[PDB]
Design a protein around this ligand. Structure first.
Ligand SMILES: [Mg+2]
Ligand SMILES: [Mg+2]
Ligand SMILES: [Mg+2]
Ligand SMILES: [Mg+2]
Ligand SMILES: [Mg+2]
Ligand SMILES: [Mg+2]
Ligand SMILES: [Mg+2]
Ligand SMILES: [Mg+2]
Ligand SMILES: [Mg+2]
Ligand SMILES: [Mg+2]
Ligand SMILES: [Mg+2]
Ligand SMILES: [Mg+2]
Ligand SMILES: [Mg+2]
Ligand SMILES: [Mg+2]
Ligand SMILES: [Mg+2]
Ligand SMILES: [Mg+2]
Ligand SMILES: [Mg+2]
Ligand SMILES: [Mg+2]
Ligand SMILES: [Mg+2]
Ligand SMILES: [Mg+2]
Ligand SMILES: [Mg+2]
Ligand SMILES: [Mg+2]
Ligand SMILES: [Mg+2]
Ligand SMILES: [Mg+2]
Ligand SMILES: [Mg+2]
Ligand SMILES: [Mg+2]
Ligand SMILES: [Mg+2]
Ligand SMILES: [Mg+2]
Ligand SMILES: [Mg+2]
Ligand SMILES: [Mg+2]
Ligand SMILES: [Mg+2]
Ligand SMILES: [Mg+2]
Ligand SMILES: [Mg+2]
Ligand SMILES: [Mg+2]
Ligand SMILES: [Mg+2]
Ligand SMILES: [Mg+2]
Ligand SMILES: [Mg+2]
Ligand SMILES: [Mg+2]
Ligand SMILES: [Mg+2]
Ligand SMILES: [Mg+2]
Ligand SMILES: [Mg+2]
Ligand SMILES: [Mg+2]
Ligand SMILES: [Mg+2]
Ligand SMILES: [Mg+2]
Ligand SMILES: [Mg+2]
Ligand SMILES: [Mg+2]
Ligand SMILES: [Mg+2]
Ligand SMILES: [Mg+2]
Ligand SMILES: [Mg+2]
Ligand SMILES: [Mg+2]
Ligand SMILES: [Mg+2]
Ligand SMILES: [Mg+2]
Ligand SMILES: [Mg+2]
Ligand SMILES: [Mg+2]
Ligand SMILES: [Mg+2]
Ligand SMILES: [Mg+2]
Ligand SMILES: [Mg+2]
Ligand SMILES: [Mg+2]
Ligand SMILES: [Mg+2]
Ligand SMILES: [Mg+2]
Ligand SMILES: [Mg+2]
Ligand SMILES: [Mg+2]
Ligand SMILES: [Mg+2]
Ligand SMILES: [Mg+2]
Ligand SMILES: [Mg+2]
Ligand SMILES: [Mg+2]
Ligand SMILES: [Mg+2]
Ligand SMILES: [Mg+2]
Ligand SMILES: [Mg+2]
Lengths: 213, 121, 112, 54, 116
RNA sequence: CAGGUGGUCAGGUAGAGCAUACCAAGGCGUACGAGAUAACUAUGGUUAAGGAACUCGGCAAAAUGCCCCCGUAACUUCGGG
RNA sequence: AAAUUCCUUGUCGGGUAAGUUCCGACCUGCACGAAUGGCGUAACGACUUCUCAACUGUCUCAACCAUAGACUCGGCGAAA
RNA sequence: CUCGAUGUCGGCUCGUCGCAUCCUGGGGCUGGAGCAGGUCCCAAGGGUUGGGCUGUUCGCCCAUUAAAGCGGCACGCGAGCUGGGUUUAGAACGUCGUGAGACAGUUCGGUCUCUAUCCGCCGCGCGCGUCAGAAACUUGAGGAAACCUGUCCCUAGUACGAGAGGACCGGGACGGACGAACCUCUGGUGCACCAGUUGUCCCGCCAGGGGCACCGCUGGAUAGCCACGUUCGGUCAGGAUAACCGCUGAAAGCAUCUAAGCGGGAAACCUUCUCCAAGAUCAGGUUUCUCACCCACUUGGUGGGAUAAGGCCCCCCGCAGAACACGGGUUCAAUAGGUCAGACCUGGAAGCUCAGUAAUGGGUGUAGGGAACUGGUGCUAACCGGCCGAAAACUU
C-alpha cells in the first residue's frame, strides 16, 4: 500500500502551527506524475509502476525514448522512475495513462523522501569521516589534518579492506525517514515537509509513504 | 557552560563565584544551559559567611551569555552566566534571588526559585 | 521576489508598525503560565533587524536588575500580541552592537 | 622512498605508452578563396581574418 | 560583478583590480585589445558596467567611473563618444573572439573589442 | 647561489629618531610561464560560548605597549626595588 | 628528606574539588659540614622550579578566507 | 634469524580481533520474604566519561555514570606525529678510586632524514568483453553500514513485609552520547559589498576621490561553505536457536526433556529498514529505435570505404569537479554575461540650498552604492563542423 510521487525540491522556509510553534519546512513541488508502465510478476518477476515527471521539449528526446513513450501513449517527460510496490500487485490501482497529484498524501501523515545529496568533491578524512586530526601546537610537524597510523606492523603486513580514507564525497542517494507532511497545497501542488530534504534546490526528489510511520 | 567555567552566584548564600566541575544529566554531557544542574566549587565568598571557600556545592544555571532557542522561535540572551546554589530537593539554599531568570526553570520544575526571582523572562 | 513567496504570503501578519533600529518598543508577548495565557510586556531598544520577510527577526535589549537582557523575536510571530512604538531613535548604523558594553548614562540614545 | 628494484621492459612500456598527445579535430574554412583547415574553436577568428595560416 | 571563484589574476586581488582597470583603459582607448582568454572573460562584464555608467552620463556617473579609471582622456572619450554611440543598445557592448595560442607558454589568447 | 664583504654621501611629510609608513632624486619589476575555488602542507587572517580543561611544560599564539599628570609595597649594601 | 635521602609518593602543616611537583618544619644525615669553604644575603639572570592575575584556536572542537605549492596545459629536464 | 643497522618507554592518531563479560539481554541455584545481592551457565550487537599528581605504564584521588572490562596484534601503530624518561659529547652533588675516571644513584642542557618503484587500501577514468549497433527503466547472487542507554509518571504505596521499606509484568513523556542530511532560524567566516577613520602621495587646486600601509585599521554584512544551529535515525514483525524450561515416552512392567517425535526460549544468527551491486565471464530481465549499403580479393566468421539509430569532440555554463567523469544548454535558445525590475546588505550619496565664525548640522530623499537569490528582456557569445558508429553459420 506504498504511495509514491516524483517531485522537485523548491527550498526551505518556516511556518507556524496551531500551538504557535515555528516549523522549519522544506517545500517540495510534487508535480503531476504519469505512470507509463506497470511491472507485473508474470512478465518481469516483481511488482512496480513507472512514473513520468517533468515537462520537456519533444525535440530533446531521442528516437528510442520517444518510441517507449509512444507505446504507452503519453507525452515524453524529463524523468522516469519506478515505484517498487509490494508482492501484492493486485494488478490495479494503477492504469497506464493515470495522473497522480499531491493529494495522495494528507496533513499529519508521514513520508520518506529520497534524493541525491549535494556534491562535496575530494574530501579529507576530517571532513569525510570526522577524524580528530593531530594537535596544532606542542611540536606537531605537518600532521595537523593527517590521518596518522593506518595499520599495525609485520602482523599483518597489509591494510584491511574498507579502511576509512580521503576520497570523493557526496552525490550519494540518500533517504530520510519519517518526515511529517505539515500541509499539502492542492492548488499549486506542493508539499510542506517538516525538516531537511537531501540535495540541492531544483533536484529531483521521490516522496513515498513511510514504512515505519 | 562546561567544566572549568566560572559563574556568578545569584543568591545570598554568601558565595560570589563558583567553578563548574561536572555537568550532570548523563555521562560525558558537554554543555549546561538554563535549567541544568551543576556540581561546582566555591572559588570566592563573603568573609565570615555561611558558605566557605572550597566547598563543593550543587547549583542550577539561570542565566547564559549564549542565546537559547525557544519552541516558538524566539531567543533569550543575558549578559552574564549565573547560577543558584540548591539543596538536594531543588530548593535554593539562599533566601532570595538577584536579577532575572529564564523561563526554562518552569519546565525544569524549579518553582521555588521561580517564585523567589525578581523577574522571569 | 522569491520562489517561495506564494507559500509565505498567507502567513504574513499585518498591524506591524514601522520601526527601525534604535527605537524604543513595547512588545506584548503571550505567556503560558499553566493554562492562563496572560500578556507579558518587554520594553527596550531595538538593536537589529535581520531581514527576510516571513523569516525576518528583530532583537530588543533592556536592563532589568543590573543585568542586560536581549530577546529575539520573529516578526510575524503569532506569539506577539501587538507591537507599540514609544520613541524614535537617532543612530548612524543598522546593528547597534556597541550597546552591549555600555552601562548607565553612556548607553542612552538620542530622541529623534 | 626509493624504488626497490628496476622495472621490467613490459612494465615500463605499459606506462610509458600512455604519455601521448591528443589530436585536435579540424574543420574546413575558405578565406579569400583559399581553403584552409582550422580547429573549430578558431572558426570565428579565421572568418574575421585574425588567423595567420603561415 | 560576480567575484572571481578561485585564485585572482596576476597574483592577488589588488593586482587583479589594477589589471582590470588597465585593460579597461586600453580597451576604451583602442577599441580592440588582444590578451589572454581568462583576462578577456574577466574583463567583459567589468567594462560593460563602465559603459553603462557612461550611457547614463551624469556627473555622479562620471565620478563613479573616475573611482576606477585614472586616465582622464579615456574618461572623456568614454563619456563623449562611447556612451552616446551605445545609447540605443541595451547591454552586450563587447565581443570576445578566440585566436591562436602564443608560444612560450601555450596560453590561450583572445581579442576583445567594442561591438562597433 | 635567499649567505659574507671595509669606507664615503644620504632629500620630503609625519616622527625623539639613521626606527617606522608613504614619497623625491635616482633605480627596478631579477630571466620559466598560463590556468584552476580537490585533499593535504606552508605563510598569514577571523572566529559563537568557555578560558590552560591542552601539554612533560602556557611550547606557540594572544595580551601589555606611547606622551603628560597623580601614586607607588616587603626588603635593602641606602645606590636601589 | 637537600642539585646530597636508597627505603620514598618518609611524617606533620599550607596550598588544590582532587598535589609523587612546590613552600615550612621534624631529624631516623644509606652517603652534609667550614677557603675542593659553611651559613645567609639587597641587586642581577634568553638559568632550573612552583603559584596567581590578564589573555587567548593550546584545548572542548572545529569552521571559513587569501597567498605559495600540490592539480592541468606548453618548454626544459635530474636524483637516490 | 637479524652486527656491510630488525629504531628502543610513555603519549597522540587510526584501528582490528578474542572472550577468560564491566553495562545492557536470557536463565539455574541460593543461608533468594520484597528492594537489593551472592554464585554458576548462555551471550561479543552496541556501549564502556572528564580531570588532579607523576616522563611515565602502573597507582592514589576528585566529580560523574548503566558501565567506567581483561588481553593479542614487533609489550599494534616514529618512510604517521612528539621527544617528557632511558642511551653520547658539557657541568655539578653524594659515594668509590692515589689518579685518569666510575655509579641499573641524583641533577640542569642536549640536530628525529627520505620527491612512493611494488604489494595493500581510499577514490576516479581509459580499453575490451558480455555474438548486430544503440537508448531508457530495472531484478538482486553477494556485500557494506547501523545496532547504545538514562530519568520521571500510571499500575501502586499494589504484591511482599511486624514495620522500616517496597515490587514483577505491561502502558506513556522527556533526555544524554553517536550518526546522516540540510541552511528556515541562531551563530561563525567573508580579499571585486557598504560605511567610518589615521599617516602619506597623487588626480592642477577646492570639493569629490584614488594608490600603499596585514583586506591599513574599525563597524556591519546577502551568497557559498559550515556548527555552536535545524530535522531525522537506531523501531516494529517473522524464522531458526544458546543456556534453560517442558509435552508425549520405552529400552529398564516404575521413572526418565530422548533414544522416535513435538513445543517455548536472548541486544547473539537469518529475513525486515538504509546503501552498493550483472567484470554475477552463469556477464541477467522488460522494453523501444536503426534495421541499411558500395569496392577489392586467394571469396575468406576476409580486407576496405560510406552510413542509419545513437554518441563523442568543439562551443556557452554548473551548487558537478584535481585531470577525467557527471549534469544543463546551443537561435524552434533565457545557458552564461549584459540590461531592466524585485529581494537583501549597508545606512542617508554627489550636486545644489539653508543655518552656523568654524568644526558641523538640516532639506532635496528610505537617499545613493552593491556580488552570488528570483523574474522579464533575444543585446554579446553558444558558430557556416568534424570524428566515430549496424549481424558467417549450424543442431534439435
Ligand atoms: Mg583540532
Ligand atoms: Mg616538532
Ligand atoms: Mg619539517
Ligand atoms: Mg605547523
Ligand atoms: Mg600478512
Ligand atoms: Mg534589513
Ligand atoms: Mg569567494
Ligand atoms: Mg593593499
Ligand atoms: Mg648573491
Ligand atoms: Mg658587517
Ligand atoms: Mg628621512
Ligand atoms: Mg627603514
Ligand atoms: Mg612604497
Ligand atoms: Mg600560477
Ligand atoms: Mg586544479
Ligand atoms: Mg573564541
Ligand atoms: Mg568572544
Ligand atoms: Mg591559570
Ligand atoms: Mg592540566
Ligand atoms: Mg590531560
Ligand atoms: Mg612564549
Ligand atoms: Mg603577537
Ligand atoms: Mg632530613
Ligand atoms: Mg648524601
Ligand atoms: Mg616527601
Ligand atoms: Mg603541574
Ligand atoms: Mg622542603
Ligand atoms: Mg680547615
Ligand atoms: Mg664535599
Ligand atoms: Mg677544605
Ligand atoms: Mg662557593
Ligand atoms: Mg646556603
Ligand atoms: Mg649575562
Ligand atoms: Mg640566563
Ligand atoms: Mg626540590
Ligand atoms: Mg609539464
Ligand atoms: Mg644486530
Ligand atoms: Mg660491523
Ligand atoms: Mg641489506
Ligand atoms: Mg585493543
Ligand atoms: Mg562464555
Ligand atoms: Mg532477607
Ligand atoms: Mg544469578
Ligand atoms: Mg558484545
Ligand atoms: Mg544481528
Ligand atoms: Mg610497540
Ligand atoms: Mg621519527
Ligand atoms: Mg612504521
Ligand atoms: Mg612510541
Ligand atoms: Mg617501516
Ligand atoms: Mg630529553
Ligand atoms: Mg632530563
Ligand atoms: Mg661528562
Ligand atoms: Mg678521595
Ligand atoms: Mg654508566
Ligand atoms: Mg612523503
Ligand atoms: Mg542479498
Ligand atoms: Mg566477487
Ligand atoms: Mg555531514
Ligand atoms: Mg539563506
Ligand atoms: Mg546567520
Ligand atoms: Mg568598492
Ligand atoms: Mg588615504
Ligand atoms: Mg581636499
Ligand atoms: Mg604609489
Ligand atoms: Mg548566510
Ligand atoms: Mg513425564
Ligand atoms: Mg554535454
Ligand atoms: Mg546629499
Amino acid at each position: 500500500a506504498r504511495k509514491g510521487i516524483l517531485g522537485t525540491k523548491l527550498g526551505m522556509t518556516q511556518v507556524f502551527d496551531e500551538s504557535n510553534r515555528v516549523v522549519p519546512v522544506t517545500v517540495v513541488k510534487a508535480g503531476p506524475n504519469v505512470v507509463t508502465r506497470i511491472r507485473t510478476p508474470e512478465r518481469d518477476g516483481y511488482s512496480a509502476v513507472q512514473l513520468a515527471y517533468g515537462e520537456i521539449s519533444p525535440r530533446k528526446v531521442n528516437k528510442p525514448l520517444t518510441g517507449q513513450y509512444t507505446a504507452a501513449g503519453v507525452n515524453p517527460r524529463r524523468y522516469l522512475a519506478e515505484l517498487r510496490l509490494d508482492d501484492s500487485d493486485a494488478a490495479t490501482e494503477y492504469q497506464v495513462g493515470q495522473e497522480l497529484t499531491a493529494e495522495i498524501f494528507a496533513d499529519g501523515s508521514y513520508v520518506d523522501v529520497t534524493g541525491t545529496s549535494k556534491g562535496k568533491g575530494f574530501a579529507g578524512t576530517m571532513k569525510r569521516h570526522g577524524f580528530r586530526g593531530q594537535g596544532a601546537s606542542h611540536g606537531a610537524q605537518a600532521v595537523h589534518r593527517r590521518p596518522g597510523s593506518i595499520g599495525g606492523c609485520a602482523t599483518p603486513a597489509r591494510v584491511f579492506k574498507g579502511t576509512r580514507m580521503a576520497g570523493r564525497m557526496g552525490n550519494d542517494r540518500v533517504t530520510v525517514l519519517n518526515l511529517l507532511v505539515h500541509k499539502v497545497d492542492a492548488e499549486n501542488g506542493v508539499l510542506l515537509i517538516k525538516g531537511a530534504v537531501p540535495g540541492r534546490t531544483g533536484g529531483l526528489v521521490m516522496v513515498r509513504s513511510a514504512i515505519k510511520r | 557552560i562546561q567544566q572549568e567555567s566560572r559563574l556568578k552566584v545569584a543568591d545570598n548564600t554568601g558565595a560570589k563565584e563558583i567553578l563548574c566541575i561536572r555537568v550532570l544529566g548523563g555521562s560525558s554531557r558537554r554543555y549546561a544551559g538554563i535549567g541544568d544542574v551543576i556540581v561546582a566549587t566555591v572559588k570566592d565568598a563573603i568573609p565570615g559567611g555561611n558558605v566557605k571557600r572550597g566547598d563543593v556545592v550543587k547549583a542550577v544555571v539561570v542565566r547564559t551569555v549564549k542565546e537559547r532557542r525557544r519552541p516558538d522561535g524566539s531567543y533569550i540572551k543575558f549578559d552574564e552566566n549565573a547560577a543558584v546554589i540548591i539543596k538536594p530537593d531543588n530548593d535554593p539554599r539562599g533566601t532570595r534571588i538577584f536579577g532575572p531568570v529564564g523561563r526554562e526553570l518552569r519546565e525544569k520544575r524549579f518553582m521555588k526559585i521561580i517564585s523567589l526571582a525578581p523577574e522571569v523572562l | 521576489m522569491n520562489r517561495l513567496d506564494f507559500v509565505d504570503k498567507p502567513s504574513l501578519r499585518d498591524d506591524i508598525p514601522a520601526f527601525n533600529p534604535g527605537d524604543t518598543i513595547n512588545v506584548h508577548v503571550k505567556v503560558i503560565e499553566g493554562a492562563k495565557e496572560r500578556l507579558q510586556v518587554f520594553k527596550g531598544v531595538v538593536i537589529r533587524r535581520q531581514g527576510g520577510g516571513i523569516r525576518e527577526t528583530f532583537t530588543v535589549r533592556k536592563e532589568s536588575y543590573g543585568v542586560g537582557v536581549e530577546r529575539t523575536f520573529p516578526v510575524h510571530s503569532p506569539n506577539i500580541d501587538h507591537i507599540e512604538v514609544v520613541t524614535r531613535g537617532d543612530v548612524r548604523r543598522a546593528k547597534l552592537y556597541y550597546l552591549r558594553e555600555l552601562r548607565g548614562k553612556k548607553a542612552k540614545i538620542k530622541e529623534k | 622512498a626509493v624504488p626497490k628494484r628496476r622495472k621490467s621492459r613490459s612494465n615500463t612500456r605499459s606506462r610509458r605508452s600512455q604519455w601521448k598527445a591528443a589530436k585536435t579535430e579540424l574543420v574546413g574554412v575558405t578565406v579569400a578563396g583559399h581553403a584552409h583547415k582550422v580547429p573549430r574553436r578558431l572558426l570565428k577568428a579565421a572568418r574575421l581574418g585574425l588567423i595567420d595560416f603561415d | 560583478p560576480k567575484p572571481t571563484k578561485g585564485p585572482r589574476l596576476g597574483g592577488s586581488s589588488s593586482h587583479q583590480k589594477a589589471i582590470l582597470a588597465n585593460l579597461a583603459t586600453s580597451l576604451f582607448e583602442h577599441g580592440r585589445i588582444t590578451t589572454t582568454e581568462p583576462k578577456a572573460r574577466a574583463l567583459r562584464p567589468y567594462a560593460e558596467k563602465l559603459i553603462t555608467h557612461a550611457k547614463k552620463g551624469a556627473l555622479h556617473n562620471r565620478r563613479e567611473v573616475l573611482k576606477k579609471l585614472r586616465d582622464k582622456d579615456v574618461v572623456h572619450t568614454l563619456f563623449a563618444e562611447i556612451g552616446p554611440f551605445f545609447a540605443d543598445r541595451d547591454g552586450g557592448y563587447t565581443r570576445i573572439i578566440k585566436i591562436e595560442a602564443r608560444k612560450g607558454d601555450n596560453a590561450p589568447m583572445a581579442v576583445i573589442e567594442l561591438v562597433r
